Write an enzyme that holds these catalytic residues in place. Sequence first.
Site: not given
Lengths: 182, 183
Positions: B66, B103
Site C-alpha cells: 500500500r 503481531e
Amino acid sequence: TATAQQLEYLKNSIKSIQDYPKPGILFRDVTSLLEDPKAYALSIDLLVERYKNAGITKVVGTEARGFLFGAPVALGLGVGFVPVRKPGKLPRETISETYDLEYGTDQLEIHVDAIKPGDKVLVVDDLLATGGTIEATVKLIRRLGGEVADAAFIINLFDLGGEQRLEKQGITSYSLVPFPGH
Amino acid sequence: MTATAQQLEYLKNSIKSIQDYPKPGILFRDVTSLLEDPKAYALSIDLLVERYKNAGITKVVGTEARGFLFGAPVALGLGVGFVPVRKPGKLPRETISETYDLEYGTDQLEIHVDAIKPGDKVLVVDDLLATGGTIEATVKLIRRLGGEVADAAFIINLFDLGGEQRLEKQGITSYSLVPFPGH
Ligand SMILES: Nc1ncnc2[nH]cnc12
Ligand SMILES: Nc1ncnc2[nH]cnc12
Ligand SMILES: [Cl-]
Ligand SMILES: [Cl-]
Ligand SMILES: [Cl-]
Ligand SMILES: [Cl-]
Ligand SMILES: [Cl-]
Ligand code: NA
Ligand code: NA
C-alpha cells in the site's frame, strides 16, 4: 504514438540480469526505470497519452508492481484506482480468481463495489510474460460487469506470446519496451 | 502552502472503516475507498508533495504494497527517483535486509544497495502509521546505505498507537493527513 528517442530511453533505462531467478532467464528489472525520474515520468506520461481519449472510468492494477504503474496512470487520467490484491488483504466484500504460479496456484481478489456496469477499465501492469495474472484480473472486472478491452505494460516479452493470448480474450495490449527471450 | 479544513475533512470522510477486519476488535481504516475517488486520491498526493517540494528530497522510499500507492506518485510529484522496499525475494539485484515485528513473530524488508548513496536525502512514504515498525526498519536500511532520512509521510495516523513519538526518537518527523483514534 511515442517517438523513437522516447522508446529507446525507456528500453535503455531497464537493467537485465542473466540467470535470475534461475539459469537461462535474462531478467528485465523495472526497478532501474523507477529510480530514474526521467524514465519513470516518461513511462507514465506515455500511458496517460495513449488512453486520454479512451473514455476510461477506472484503472485496475495488480499487487504490487502493478500499483507502481496503474496508480500514477489513474492520477494522470483523473480516474479512480482499484487494486487487485493477494488474498485476505482487502477489507470489504471481494470476489476471487484462481490462477497458476510457477510452483502452485494462488488467488487474486477485488472489492465487489469497486467496479460496476458502465465502467470502462484499463488494466496496467509492469510486465507481460504469459499474461496469466492479467487474464485473472480481466475475469474479476467482467464478473462485476465492467468493460475492459485494454491492458498497458511497461515491458512486453514478445517471445512468451502474451499479447496474442490476451487478444483471444478481447484485450488489446499497449507495451512501451519489447524484449526478446523467456 | 497549508491544507484547508475542507481538504482534510474530504480526505477523512473518503476513508471507510470496517469492524473486525482483519481480526475481531480492530476497526480497520481502509484507504482503498480514497484510491477509488479521483478527487481524494489526487488531493492526498498534492498535500504530501506540497509539504516536501522545498525540502531537497533526492529519493522517495515506499514500503510494499500500500506504501507504493502513495510513495510513487509523491516521487513523481517531487521529480525524484522512487525506491521500493520489499518483502524478501522480490528485488533481483544486491539487497540488504532489516527485521521488524509483526503481531506474532517477525518479517524482513529489503532494499537494493545501489538505490541509496551518501548525499541522498530520503523521504519515506506509507499509507498508515500504526506501531511504525516497518518505518523504523526502512530508516535503518536507508542509513546503512549512507542516506540521510529525517522525514516520513502518511495518509493515516493512528495516534493512539504512539508511532509518531517512536519515530521522533529515531530522528524522524512524521507528516500525516488523516488522524483516527483506536488501534
Ligand atoms: N525475463 C523476464 N524478466 C522479467 N520477468 C519475467 N517473467 C518471465 N520472464 C521474465
Ligand atoms: N485500524 C487499523 N486499520 C488499518 N491498519 C491498521 N494497522 C493497525 N491498526 C490498523
Ligand atoms: Cl509484484
Ligand atoms: Cl469469487
Ligand atoms: Cl467468468
Ligand atoms: Cl500492504
Ligand atoms: Cl473513528
Ligand atoms: Na533449467
Ligand atoms: Na537476492
